[PDB]
Amino acid sequence: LSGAVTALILVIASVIIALVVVGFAFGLFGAFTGQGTVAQVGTATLSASTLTLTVTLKNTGASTQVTGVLINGNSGSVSGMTTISAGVNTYTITISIGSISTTLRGLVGSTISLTLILSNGETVTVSAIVTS
Amino acid sequence: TGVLINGNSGSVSGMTTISAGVNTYTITISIGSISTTLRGLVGSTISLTLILSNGETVTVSAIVTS
Amino acid sequence: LSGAVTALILVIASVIIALVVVGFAFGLFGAFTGQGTVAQVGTATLSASTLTLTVTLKNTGASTQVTGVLINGNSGSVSGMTTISAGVNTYTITISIGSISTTLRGLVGSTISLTLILSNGETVTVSAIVTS
Amino acid sequence: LSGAVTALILVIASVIIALVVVGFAFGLFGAFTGQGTVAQVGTATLSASTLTLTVTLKNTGASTQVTGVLINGNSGSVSGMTTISAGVNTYTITISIGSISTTLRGLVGSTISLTLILSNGETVTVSAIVTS
Amino acid sequence: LSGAVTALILVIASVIIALVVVGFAFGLFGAFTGQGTVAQVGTATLSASTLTLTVTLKNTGASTQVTGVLINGNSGSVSGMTTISAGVNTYTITISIGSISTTLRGLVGSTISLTLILSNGETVTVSAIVTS
Amino acid sequence: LSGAVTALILVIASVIIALVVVGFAFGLFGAFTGQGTVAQVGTATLSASTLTLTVTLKNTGASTQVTGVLINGNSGSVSGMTTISAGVNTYTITISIGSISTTLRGLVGSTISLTLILSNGETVTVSAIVTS
């Protein structure tokens, strides 16, 4: 008689566990779909006298952060408008590096490529015109 | 039961009932902040999620128009 | 007995999930195909006395917008016919920059290159004759 | 009952592995963006009496090295200012070849083309005026 | 009573097997990452009188071997510095083909392209100047 | 006792199914490799008086067919040597269009570009000299 009791107990436990796994899979779907996709929608302007990056970013996911910046050699901090809203927006970020100060002064008018290290593990490649 | 756009989850207010077969549904979404946020994405692609009553989430791709 | 129940539950869940993924992939196809492709089909005219750009644009995709303009140094707003219908059309856009006013007055008759920053993340390179 | 346990074990392992791969891909992005781009921004001067190359180089990436030089026939070593900082800078490199000594003495005033072999796998083509 | 005994036996077997599979997957990751990446970081020199290839190779993976060479028509053996250490290094490889002897003697000064067949399944394309 | 029976039944069924899938994948490999690659290996001659295309085609795959032709405006049928053997061969195809008759008569000596729509879904771009 114990055999059928064990059979039912195991059947119901397996059903509960399978439903848990399926719910987890669909939660993973919904979470990865809306994780946050940040890209560039136009050229940036890198003021070399003040070292200020004005960039237009498009974010069609969750509201992420800007944790770091990667310029030619050094990775520097950021000190302005770190919060990336959703949609398309123009952000004005003040970059802080030790050595790059006055290094760009000899590049006014030329193009440059930066990287933005976001909080959600994504890195964004940015193109900019160096100005003064 | 619900919709999931870039940041926020919002209610739906139309044709919530999914009949069987293939059908074209016109769902009115309601979020507080996303109002006028998509106005700068006209023409671009976007990805949404639909939270159904049977525990299944459906991933949808959409073109943003105006 | 529970093993086969679990097996069928997982099989059906996997079928549902795979169908969801395939539908999403084909939706992505159809969405990226008709996202909006804007190009130039003839030289533009940049009136320097009024700073007005008359340009013929071809758009074989979705109806986009014109968010910004990029002239030699500055990025400026636009204040006319920002909506790009489908097909080939002649648009008359009034550009607004602070300093470029009366700067092109010494370029009448010469060629120039502008950029149009569209709402769908695309930038269009435009060539124009500067007139007055 | 074991089926669903195995299913969740594999699901979580797959999520971990996929996240690892995605992080690696974005790291590759960030690394290749700032790998180091060196070009020339003005004519060089090749002193043929002392065989010294004075060249103005622009480097908008990581700080690379100058490992070799390639003049008409021979590849020779360099013995000065091997380190290329970031930005635009004027470098005075002392080249050393066995045979080219006194060979350029018959080219004073004419043009010549060199190659620079950098540490980051990139070769830079340089143009120079031979002087004395 | 046997049902639950079988259930636990199968559960522990499944956990052991899944852990084996996951460990094997991560080992595959670590192994394919450091398998050996060999490329060229500067033009090679192909001495046509002695038929000797002086080439600068960059290898950022495991220490591979040079098993064969592929010149214009024929694949030939190699007889020197077959072992590719890690890093950037200058290798002097003596090639041996029966027919190509004295064939390059009419190509001095021109450019040529060779292939190196490595031990780790990778073929490396090399560009060289033919000298004498 | 039923649990282990179920486990082995599912194990053998899964092994059979996995082997079926792997066999199908390798069949897909072998089938896509030898599908038929048709290209041009020399200029074609388009006789405008008789409207006859003499073209040398190279096909290193399966023996495909020529289902249609695409000339400047119209898509026309073919009425000769529709079968493409393997190897390099010179084919003489009689094209049939309603309007193009006597239209090429004003292009004798000039170059033109055609398209061949093959049976295997591949289109081949051809260049031809218009003759008479």
XYZ file of C-alpha atoms in Angstrom:
726
model
C 0.000 0.000 0.000
C 2.969 2.270 0.646
C 3.987 2.058 -3.010
C 1.077 4.100 -4.325
C 1.404 6.631 -1.499
C 5.065 7.151 -2.385
C 4.098 7.399 -6.052
C 1.604 10.192 -5.399
C 3.975 12.073 -3.093
C 6.733 11.979 -5.700
C 4.347 12.921 -8.518
C 3.109 16.013 -6.699
C 6.615 17.012 -5.615
C 7.842 16.691 -9.201
C 4.938 18.793 -10.466
C 5.655 21.540 -7.931
C 9.366 21.553 -8.749
C 8.776 21.589 -12.508
C 6.416 24.542 -12.143
C 9.059 26.338 -10.071
C 11.661 25.770 -12.787
C 9.324 26.947 -15.550
C 8.414 30.092 -13.633
C 12.110 30.781 -13.131
C 12.814 30.358 -16.847
C 10.078 32.791 -17.842
C 11.247 35.265 -15.214
C 14.714 35.033 -16.743
C 13.196 35.804 -20.142
C 11.372 38.879 -18.912
C 14.409 40.068 -16.974
C 16.942 39.718 -19.778
C 14.606 41.392 -22.266
C 14.425 44.566 -20.186
C 17.972 44.747 -18.851
C 18.977 47.999 -20.531
C 20.388 48.654 -23.999
C 22.467 51.825 -24.328
C 23.828 53.031 -27.671
C 24.899 56.249 -29.375
C 22.669 58.256 -31.705
C 25.017 61.019 -32.792
C 28.513 62.403 -32.422
C 29.862 63.452 -29.058
C 31.750 66.649 -28.269
C 34.819 66.402 -26.041
C 35.780 69.836 -24.716
C 39.527 69.521 -24.173
C 40.006 72.737 -22.196
C 37.472 71.662 -19.557
C 37.508 67.947 -20.513
C 33.717 67.702 -20.740
C 31.934 65.041 -22.793
C 28.566 65.987 -24.303
C 27.011 62.854 -25.786
C 23.560 61.797 -26.984
C 22.637 58.326 -25.739
C 19.670 56.066 -26.467
C 18.577 53.643 -23.742
C 15.637 51.330 -24.439
C 15.844 49.311 -21.224
C 16.223 49.764 -17.482
C 17.717 52.938 -16.035
C 21.420 52.128 -15.702
C 24.404 54.082 -14.394
C 27.703 55.277 -15.840
C 30.383 53.831 -13.583
C 33.510 54.651 -15.557
C 35.052 56.070 -18.698
C 37.927 54.687 -20.768
C 39.906 57.232 -22.790
C 43.018 56.495 -24.860
C 45.221 55.168 -22.048
C 43.626 55.769 -18.669
C 40.314 54.845 -17.080
C 38.917 57.869 -15.281
C 35.933 58.675 -13.126
C 32.818 60.652 -14.031
C 31.288 63.531 -12.096
C 28.045 64.528 -13.776
C 24.711 63.151 -15.008
C 25.759 59.593 -14.198
C 22.112 58.439 -14.297
C 20.940 57.290 -17.733
C 17.199 57.817 -18.073
C 15.209 55.884 -20.638
C 14.807 57.255 -24.143
C 17.159 59.500 -26.090
C 18.905 62.185 -24.071
C 21.864 64.561 -24.142
C 24.218 63.994 -21.200
C 27.020 66.310 -20.054
C 29.656 64.321 -18.148
C 32.731 65.880 -16.534
C 35.641 63.425 -16.775
C 38.492 63.389 -14.237
C 41.914 61.946 -15.109
C 45.307 62.880 -13.699
C 47.553 62.911 -16.762
C 45.176 63.490 -19.695
C 44.768 67.087 -18.489
C 46.053 69.321 -21.328
C 47.017 66.248 -23.379
C 44.065 66.631 -25.752
C 44.931 70.319 -26.250
C 46.927 69.284 -29.328
C 44.012 67.423 -30.945
C 41.380 70.167 -31.275
C 39.291 69.449 -34.352
C 40.187 65.768 -34.736
C 38.142 62.662 -33.994
C 38.565 60.362 -31.000
C 37.015 57.178 -29.601
C 35.997 56.637 -25.975
C 34.359 53.838 -24.029
C 31.681 54.147 -21.356
C 31.662 51.417 -18.704
C 28.059 51.155 -17.524
C 26.730 49.672 -14.304
C 24.924 46.783 -16.034
C 28.100 45.185 -17.387
C 27.728 46.798 -20.817
C 30.394 48.941 -22.474
C 29.444 51.564 -25.059
C 31.837 52.669 -27.791
C 31.524 56.407 -28.429
C 32.884 58.630 -31.204
C 33.638 62.259 -30.455
C 35.013 65.461 -31.941
C 37.667 67.092 -29.777
C 36.957 70.793 -29.280
C 38.236 73.606 -27.086
C -2.166 40.883 -16.997
C 0.734 43.271 -17.474
C 3.232 44.865 -19.814
C 6.956 45.457 -19.322
C 8.536 48.320 -21.268
C 12.129 49.529 -20.887
C 12.048 50.393 -17.177
C 8.523 50.254 -15.805
C 5.754 47.677 -15.659
C 2.375 49.170 -16.497
C -1.262 48.214 -16.723
C -3.110 47.458 -19.952
C -6.536 48.827 -20.806
C -7.894 47.122 -23.899
C -8.422 43.740 -25.577
C -6.908 41.956 -22.588
C -8.591 38.675 -23.610
C -6.485 36.540 -25.957
C -8.769 34.329 -28.026
C -7.438 31.242 -29.758
C -5.828 31.468 -33.175
C -3.942 34.330 -34.791
C -5.381 37.759 -34.085
C -4.506 41.452 -34.129
C -4.854 43.078 -30.700
C -4.881 46.818 -29.953
C -3.734 47.250 -26.340
C -3.636 50.658 -24.651
C -0.681 50.828 -22.244
C -0.586 53.149 -19.215
C 2.628 54.249 -17.487
C 3.162 57.490 -15.588
C 6.664 58.451 -16.700
C 7.101 56.870 -20.152
C 4.547 59.387 -21.450
C 6.391 61.500 -24.069
C 9.599 59.503 -23.514
C 9.235 57.434 -26.689
C 8.658 60.644 -28.678
C 12.395 60.610 -29.430
C 12.451 57.026 -30.745
C 10.095 57.365 -33.729
C 11.158 54.943 -36.440
C 13.499 52.886 -34.255
C 12.997 49.351 -32.979
C 12.106 48.405 -29.408
C 11.486 45.264 -27.346
C 8.610 44.733 -24.911
C 7.424 41.911 -22.689
C 3.852 40.785 -22.056
C 3.026 39.173 -18.708
C 0.167 36.740 -19.301
C -2.238 35.170 -16.833
C -0.830 31.649 -17.313
C 2.596 32.539 -15.924
C 4.161 32.881 -19.380
C 5.981 36.006 -20.547
C 6.025 36.790 -24.270
C 8.844 38.781 -25.857
C 7.626 41.232 -28.504
C 9.488 43.378 -31.031
C 7.930 46.628 -32.173
C 8.503 49.606 -34.439
C 7.941 52.932 -32.700
C 5.623 55.209 -34.670
C 3.716 58.417 -34.011
C 5.854 7.155 -12.458
C 6.749 10.749 -11.633
C 9.719 10.638 -13.999
C 7.635 10.476 -17.159
C 5.264 13.172 -15.892
C 8.237 15.465 -15.309
C 9.589 14.542 -18.742
C 6.390 15.556 -20.524
C 6.000 18.746 -18.489
C 9.540 19.762 -19.410
C 9.051 18.803 -23.065
C 5.959 20.977 -23.386
C 7.570 23.878 -21.531
C 10.594 23.668 -23.826
C 8.371 23.648 -26.908
C 6.492 26.731 -25.699
C 9.725 28.562 -24.905
C 11.368 27.678 -28.221
C 8.297 28.885 -30.102
C 8.455 32.154 -28.159
C 12.115 32.598 -29.108
C 11.461 31.847 -32.781
C 8.560 34.288 -32.921
C 10.766 36.934 -31.337
C 13.506 36.307 -33.900
C 11.160 36.672 -36.860
C 9.635 39.777 -35.306
C 13.142 41.206 -35.051
C 13.636 40.442 -38.740
C 10.473 42.225 -39.792
C 11.212 45.160 -37.502
C 14.784 45.745 -38.645
C 13.818 45.445 -42.309
C 11.403 48.374 -42.166
C 13.128 50.600 -39.624
C 13.650 53.558 -41.945
C 16.414 54.261 -44.456
C 17.015 57.919 -45.313
C 19.371 59.080 -48.064
C 19.967 62.078 -50.331
C 18.868 62.100 -53.966
C 20.200 65.456 -55.108
C 22.185 68.451 -53.936
C 20.814 70.668 -51.205
C 20.637 74.457 -51.112
C 21.767 76.278 -47.970
C 20.507 79.868 -48.024
C 23.034 81.780 -45.926
C 21.089 85.033 -45.608
C 18.200 83.181 -43.943
C 20.111 79.962 -43.095
C 17.488 77.702 -44.678
C 18.246 74.197 -45.951
C 16.250 72.952 -48.949
C 17.047 69.265 -49.398
C 15.572 66.350 -51.346
C 15.487 63.194 -49.231
C 14.498 59.609 -50.001
C 13.062 57.487 -47.189
C 12.169 53.875 -48.003
C 11.305 52.900 -44.431
C 9.246 54.073 -41.476
C 8.405 57.738 -40.963
C 11.245 59.121 -38.840
C 11.964 62.564 -37.402
C 14.813 65.060 -37.694
C 16.199 65.680 -34.221
C 19.294 67.717 -34.997
C 21.654 69.194 -37.546
C 25.457 69.229 -37.554
C 27.109 72.050 -39.499
C 30.844 72.798 -39.597
C 31.389 73.354 -35.867
C 28.103 73.537 -34.003
C 25.066 71.311 -33.598
C 21.869 73.320 -33.872
C 18.144 72.811 -33.658
C 15.730 72.625 -36.581
C 12.432 74.473 -36.847
C 10.541 73.260 -39.894
C 9.253 70.124 -41.638
C 10.910 67.850 -39.089
C 8.685 64.924 -40.150
C 10.149 62.784 -42.939
C 7.336 61.126 -44.866
C 7.990 58.019 -46.915
C 9.173 58.349 -50.493
C 11.137 61.132 -52.155
C 10.329 64.625 -50.941
C 11.679 68.170 -50.811
C 12.017 69.505 -47.259
C 12.610 73.113 -46.181
C 14.289 73.157 -42.757
C 15.052 76.393 -40.907
C 18.288 75.846 -38.959
C 19.018 77.765 -35.740
C 22.567 78.267 -34.441
C 23.857 81.162 -32.361
C 27.206 81.977 -33.959
C 26.967 80.600 -37.514
C 24.668 83.533 -38.319
C 26.463 85.585 -41.016
C 29.387 83.130 -41.050
C 28.391 81.485 -44.335
C 27.948 84.947 -45.888
C 31.520 84.595 -47.166
C 30.910 81.180 -48.761
C 28.214 81.987 -51.339
C 28.708 79.787 -54.381
C 30.870 77.213 -52.592
C 30.036 73.660 -51.566
C 29.540 72.490 -47.985
C 28.778 69.263 -46.115
C 26.184 68.936 -43.352
C 24.919 66.059 -41.244
C 21.331 65.308 -40.251
C 20.860 63.511 -36.928
C 17.602 61.584 -37.268
C 15.356 60.211 -34.547
C 16.012 56.576 -35.533
C 19.703 56.707 -34.624
C 20.812 57.270 -38.224
C 22.939 60.185 -39.415
C 22.699 61.331 -43.035
C 25.587 63.055 -44.802
C 24.298 65.875 -47.010
C 26.085 67.991 -49.618
C 24.850 71.484 -50.366
C 25.533 74.630 -52.357
C 25.701 77.759 -50.221
C 23.542 80.509 -51.713
C 22.074 83.830 -50.623
C 11.904 13.719 -9.451
C 15.530 13.826 -10.553
C 14.519 15.211 -13.942
C 13.533 18.637 -12.654
C 16.578 18.834 -10.378
C 18.824 18.167 -13.373
C 16.831 20.692 -15.396
C 17.378 23.497 -12.900
C 21.044 22.612 -12.383
C 21.604 22.839 -16.131
C 19.534 26.025 -16.443
C 21.570 27.839 -13.804
C 24.863 26.555 -15.206
C 23.801 27.789 -18.644
C 22.895 31.215 -17.272
C 26.271 31.512 -15.535
C 28.151 30.455 -18.665
C 26.195 32.778 -20.957
C 26.839 35.713 -18.634
C 30.551 34.867 -18.618
C 30.609 34.843 -22.422
C 28.736 38.149 -22.658
C 31.101 39.796 -20.190
C 34.051 38.523 -22.208
C 32.585 39.945 -25.417
C 32.060 43.384 -23.900
C 35.555 43.306 -22.432
C 36.837 42.575 -25.929
C 34.932 45.622 -27.167
C 36.439 47.897 -24.551
C 39.920 46.491 -25.108
C 39.957 46.803 -28.891
C 38.528 50.323 -28.739
C 41.484 51.696 -26.788
C 44.276 49.532 -28.171
C 46.324 52.410 -29.566
C 46.091 54.292 -32.861
C 49.312 55.910 -34.082
C 49.545 58.023 -37.242
C 51.602 60.900 -38.622
C 50.502 64.535 -38.494
C 53.344 66.220 -40.346
C 56.460 65.561 -42.379
C 59.465 64.047 -40.662
C 63.086 65.162 -40.889
C 65.741 62.500 -41.469
C 69.158 63.961 -40.648
C 71.492 61.945 -42.868
C 74.734 63.119 -41.260
C 73.697 61.727 -37.864
C 70.820 59.540 -39.151
C 68.215 60.964 -36.770
C 64.458 60.888 -37.373
C 62.446 63.814 -35.995
C 58.779 62.949 -36.479
C 55.445 64.248 -35.185
C 53.165 61.377 -34.174
C 49.551 61.326 -33.005
C 48.518 58.486 -30.690
C 44.892 58.425 -29.533
C 45.029 55.073 -27.746
C 47.207 53.196 -25.282
C 50.863 54.055 -24.735
C 52.746 51.812 -27.167
C 56.434 51.364 -27.961
C 58.621 51.733 -31.039
C 60.264 48.351 -31.510
C 61.683 48.705 -34.999
C 62.278 50.887 -38.021
C 62.214 49.891 -41.690
C 64.212 52.045 -44.111
C 64.765 51.308 -47.808
C 66.414 47.890 -47.481
C 67.271 47.103 -43.879
C 65.339 46.932 -40.626
C 67.295 48.623 -37.861
C 66.985 49.304 -34.170
C 66.048 52.587 -32.509
C 67.888 54.160 -29.591
C 65.870 57.102 -28.321
C 62.385 58.108 -27.147
C 61.012 54.627 -27.798
C 57.890 55.368 -25.711
C 54.930 56.954 -27.512
C 52.823 58.921 -25.049
C 49.229 59.786 -25.841
C 48.352 62.876 -27.838
C 50.390 64.657 -30.490
C 54.116 64.836 -29.843
C 57.464 65.370 -31.551
C 59.894 62.467 -31.131
C 63.636 62.437 -31.854
C 64.641 58.838 -32.620
C 68.249 57.801 -33.241
C 68.221 55.019 -35.853
C 71.072 52.494 -36.121
C 71.818 50.449 -39.251
C 75.114 48.907 -40.314
C 75.254 49.766 -44.011
C 72.904 52.742 -44.476
C 75.532 54.929 -42.783
C 76.618 57.508 -45.405
C 74.168 56.073 -47.960
C 71.598 58.854 -47.554
C 74.361 61.460 -47.991
C 73.441 61.497 -51.690
C 69.741 62.212 -51.075
C 69.888 65.504 -49.152
C 66.825 67.574 -49.975
C 64.791 64.729 -51.483
C 61.840 62.836 -50.035
C 61.836 59.337 -48.550
C 59.397 56.876 -46.970
C 59.965 54.892 -43.772
C 57.991 52.377 -41.749
C 57.759 52.199 -37.960
C 57.072 48.837 -36.311
C 55.242 49.445 -33.034
C 54.801 47.139 -30.063
C 51.036 46.820 -30.638
C 51.396 44.978 -33.947
C 50.688 48.099 -36.010
C 52.988 49.527 -38.680
C 53.042 53.266 -39.382
C 54.054 54.670 -42.764
C 56.077 57.880 -42.448
C 57.209 60.431 -45.033
C 60.363 62.432 -44.447
C 62.669 65.024 -45.960
C 66.322 64.002 -45.937
C 68.563 66.695 -44.465
C 72.155 67.028 -43.309
C 9.264 1.801 0.055
C 11.511 1.058 -2.910
C 10.145 4.065 -4.788
C 11.773 6.695 -2.601
C 15.033 4.736 -2.437
C 15.163 4.685 -6.236
C 14.239 8.371 -6.325
C 17.137 9.379 -4.087
C 19.612 7.104 -5.874
C 18.644 8.697 -9.180
C 18.754 12.206 -7.695
C 22.307 11.798 -6.428
C 23.419 10.136 -9.663
C 21.923 13.026 -11.633
C 23.671 15.600 -9.453
C 27.021 13.841 -9.864
C 26.604 13.602 -13.635
C 25.514 17.230 -13.989
C 28.513 18.382 -11.964
C 30.799 16.332 -14.215
C 29.267 17.957 -17.294
C 29.584 21.472 -15.870
C 33.208 20.929 -14.883
C 33.964 19.624 -18.363
C 32.319 22.677 -19.932
C 34.354 25.113 -17.851
C 37.510 23.146 -18.599
C 36.691 23.480 -22.289
C 36.400 27.232 -21.774
C 39.758 27.537 -20.062
C 41.424 25.291 -22.625
C 40.094 27.011 -25.736
C 41.023 30.406 -24.309
C 44.742 29.676 -24.069
C 45.102 27.448 -27.117
C 47.609 29.698 -28.877
C 47.094 32.776 -31.049
C 49.891 33.442 -33.543
C 49.938 36.436 -35.896
C 52.443 38.647 -37.699
C 53.661 41.973 -36.328
C 55.955 43.104 -39.120
C 57.088 42.311 -42.635
C 59.167 39.206 -43.172
C 62.355 38.873 -45.202
C 62.727 35.959 -47.617
C 66.370 35.513 -48.615
C 66.188 33.942 -52.071
C 69.865 33.008 -52.350
C 69.704 30.904 -49.173
C 65.877 30.658 -49.051
C 65.608 31.770 -45.421
C 62.559 33.361 -43.790
C 63.179 35.968 -41.082
C 59.782 36.769 -39.588
C 58.471 38.516 -36.475
C 55.664 36.518 -34.867
C 53.410 37.376 -31.930
C 52.012 34.440 -29.951
C 49.738 35.190 -26.991
C 48.773 31.600 -26.200
C 50.335 28.184 -25.720
C 53.756 27.451 -27.187
C 52.906 25.880 -30.548
C 55.101 24.464 -33.307
C 55.706 25.250 -36.971
C 54.933 22.048 -38.845
C 54.885 23.248 -42.438
C 55.245 26.135 -44.845
C 53.198 26.903 -47.955
C 54.910 28.966 -50.651
C 53.447 29.812 -54.065
C 53.022 26.256 -55.366
C 54.693 23.792 -53.034
C 54.398 22.907 -49.366
C 57.835 22.381 -47.866
C 59.451 21.403 -44.605
C 61.138 23.776 -42.165
C 64.515 23.243 -40.527
C 65.077 25.890 -37.877
C 63.515 27.573 -34.833
C 60.342 25.520 -35.187
C 59.333 26.238 -31.565
C 57.217 29.377 -31.147
C 57.652 30.745 -27.634
C 55.148 33.142 -26.126
C 55.425 36.864 -26.762
C 56.820 38.735 -29.749
C 59.925 37.206 -31.277
C 62.064 37.148 -34.413
C 62.417 33.673 -35.934
C 64.880 32.533 -38.610
C 63.434 29.522 -40.451
C 65.310 27.618 -43.158
C 62.805 26.414 -45.770
C 63.429 23.367 -47.984
C 61.677 22.811 -51.321
C 63.117 20.917 -54.273
C 61.891 23.047 -57.169
C 61.559 26.589 -55.772
C 65.361 26.642 -55.475
C 66.532 29.557 -57.676
C 62.932 30.366 -58.659
C 62.718 33.440 -56.425
C 66.044 34.683 -57.839
C 63.989 36.655 -60.370
C 61.758 38.252 -57.714
C 64.291 40.249 -55.671
C 62.736 43.414 -54.289
C 59.149 42.307 -54.927
C 56.561 41.334 -52.333
C 55.311 37.799 -51.718
C 52.833 35.984 -49.467
C 53.470 32.735 -47.595
C 51.466 30.578 -45.212
C 52.651 28.867 -42.032
C 50.904 25.649 -40.988
C 51.203 25.441 -37.204
C 50.843 22.450 -34.908
C 47.655 23.795 -33.286
C 45.541 23.722 -36.443
C 46.094 27.413 -37.187
C 47.419 28.721 -40.497
C 49.124 32.119 -40.418
C 49.342 34.345 -43.489
C 52.687 36.136 -43.807
C 53.832 38.933 -46.117
C 57.492 39.186 -47.030
C 60.017 41.120 -49.084
C 62.157 38.926 -51.321
C 65.855 39.719 -50.949
C 69.157 38.094 -51.857
C 10.672 -0.228 -9.102
C 8.903 1.720 -11.833
C 11.198 4.709 -11.346
C 14.321 3.018 -12.668
C 12.419 1.451 -15.571
C 11.160 4.903 -16.550
C 14.670 6.307 -16.160
C 16.231 3.777 -18.520
C 13.411 4.054 -21.066
C 13.914 7.815 -21.162
C 17.705 7.450 -21.313
C 17.596 5.198 -24.368
C 14.917 7.294 -26.074
C 16.998 10.422 -25.488
C 20.126 8.752 -26.860
C 18.264 7.701 -30.010
C 16.879 11.209 -30.480
C 20.247 12.890 -29.922
C 21.901 10.596 -32.457
C 19.145 11.411 -34.956
C 19.735 15.134 -34.441
C 23.506 14.801 -34.829
C 23.125 12.782 -38.020
C 20.794 15.440 -39.397
C 23.308 18.172 -38.563
C 26.154 16.411 -40.353
C 23.878 15.752 -43.314
C 23.149 19.476 -43.417
C 26.898 20.106 -43.489
C 27.515 17.752 -46.380
C 24.522 19.082 -48.290
C 25.339 22.769 -47.940
C 28.962 22.176 -48.916
C 28.129 20.624 -52.282
C 25.153 22.801 -53.171
C 26.588 24.411 -56.297
C 28.764 27.509 -56.650
C 28.483 29.183 -60.057
C 30.606 32.192 -61.022
C 32.074 33.832 -64.115
C 35.635 33.242 -65.300
C 35.789 35.561 -68.293
C 33.845 38.174 -70.211
C 30.639 37.271 -71.992
C 29.623 38.156 -75.539
C 26.075 39.405 -76.095
C 25.157 39.261 -79.784
C 22.587 42.032 -80.181
C 21.392 41.057 -83.660
C 20.388 37.553 -82.538
C 20.402 38.358 -78.788
C 22.632 35.411 -77.884
C 24.753 35.276 -74.729
C 28.026 33.340 -74.924
C 29.429 33.134 -71.402
C 32.100 31.035 -69.697
C 30.868 29.790 -66.319
C 32.618 27.893 -63.531
C 30.493 25.626 -61.331
C 32.233 23.652 -58.580
C 29.116 22.152 -57.002
C 25.997 20.262 -58.015
C 24.657 20.434 -61.560
C 22.218 23.346 -61.364
C 19.989 24.964 -63.984
C 19.496 28.416 -65.483
C 15.889 29.362 -64.815
C 15.894 33.014 -65.822
C 17.855 36.003 -67.035
C 17.685 39.620 -65.875
C 18.819 42.327 -68.289
C 18.552 46.120 -67.972
C 14.781 46.312 -67.444
C 13.075 43.020 -68.187
C 13.363 39.452 -66.948
C 13.378 37.078 -69.897
C 13.387 33.349 -70.453
C 16.203 31.209 -71.834
C 16.072 28.741 -74.710
C 19.437 27.015 -74.872
C 21.910 25.049 -72.738
C 19.944 25.607 -69.538
C 21.889 22.785 -67.831
C 25.124 23.773 -66.078
C 27.572 20.880 -65.917
C 30.347 20.870 -63.351
C 33.665 22.508 -64.141
C 34.449 25.408 -66.453
C 32.414 25.528 -69.642
C 31.323 27.879 -72.416
C 27.528 28.135 -72.645
C 25.513 29.603 -75.530
C 22.121 30.802 -74.266
C 19.426 32.267 -76.516
C 17.581 34.967 -74.549
C 13.961 35.851 -75.377
C 12.460 39.215 -74.396
C 9.614 41.017 -76.137
C 10.823 44.619 -76.092
C 14.628 44.364 -75.881
C 14.644 43.210 -79.519
C 16.611 45.839 -81.503
C 17.162 47.922 -78.348
C 20.774 46.803 -77.909
C 21.472 47.645 -81.568
C 22.627 51.074 -80.374
C 25.143 49.677 -77.863
C 27.472 47.640 -80.097
C 30.962 47.716 -78.624
C 29.949 48.888 -75.145
C 29.863 46.948 -71.887
C 26.726 45.688 -70.152
C 25.813 43.805 -66.968
C 23.427 40.848 -66.738
C 22.115 38.604 -63.986
C 21.496 34.864 -64.235
C 18.814 33.459 -61.929
C 19.771 29.836 -61.298
C 17.683 26.928 -60.056
C 19.475 26.746 -56.683
C 18.355 30.197 -55.537
C 21.719 31.751 -56.421
C 22.021 34.720 -58.777
C 25.179 35.301 -60.815
C 26.319 38.745 -61.943
C 27.809 38.688 -65.448
C 29.659 41.285 -67.523
C 29.391 41.230 -71.295
C 30.531 43.015 -74.435
C 27.683 43.896 -76.782
C 28.445 42.747 -80.322
C 26.534 42.187 -83.546
